[PDB]
Design a protein around this ligand. Structure first.
Ligand SMILES: [Zn+2]
Ligand SMILES: [Zn+2]
Lengths: 121, 120
């Protein structure tokens, strides 16, 4: 019921209204979501409703690994990957658009972590 | 101007459904004022405005002469009127589905939902 980790998940991993989904999108979003001090190396935005993402914690997800959940359907996502090595802003990013399953961690029915290491079929 | 697009959302967009049963349809139809007279068939899409609009763009394909089919499945709830009276209160059966949807777009914006479309 403390919303802190859930809102943190949203800040870092949720954008219902993307524009472009190219490197410029990634570079502006990583800045707007304050993920640039230091440059976050890999960060994926999910483009769907809070309700549908939350449903991965319940009806619309399967157990994955010890504690994660995998979605039962694909989600629109944009993965921003840091380029150029240096961890100090300004931060340059490559942007990878995808429609794929996502793996998250849930706590008390809410998304609290995004598994950036998951490789979807 | 936004009129037909907003009208499309009023009748067919709900990012935050609960229940998705007869009660959901009966409250939503009333809330969206689709009850004077009772609308016979009406589908609510449970996804973002952006993703639905994308059916008019990259996440859709041409369908028929004037329509668009989504390239992926959407969570939907179809409300089908029952009881036989066009007057409030309007009663509904709910059908939850995860399916392709067909819409009409105008200039990149969704303006109608094809209730007659039968998805694989
Ligand atoms: Zn939305
Ligand atoms: Zn009827």
């Amino acid at each position: 019921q403390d919303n802190y980790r859930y809102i943190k998940f949203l800040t870092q991993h949720y954008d219902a209204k993307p524009t472009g989904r190219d490197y410029r999108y990634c570079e502006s979003m990583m800045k707007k979501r304050k993920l640039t001090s230091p440059c976050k190396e890999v960060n994926t935005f999910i483009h769907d409703t809070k309700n549908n993402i939350k449903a991965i914690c319940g009806e619309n997800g399967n157990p994955y690994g010890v504690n994660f959940r995998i979605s039962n359907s694909r989600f629109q996502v944009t993965t921003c990957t840091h380029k150029g090595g240096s961890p100090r802003p300004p931060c340059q990013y490559n942007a990878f658009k995808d429609f794929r399953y996502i793996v998250i961690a849930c706590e008390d029915g809410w998304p609290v972590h995004f598994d950036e290491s998951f490789i979807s079929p």
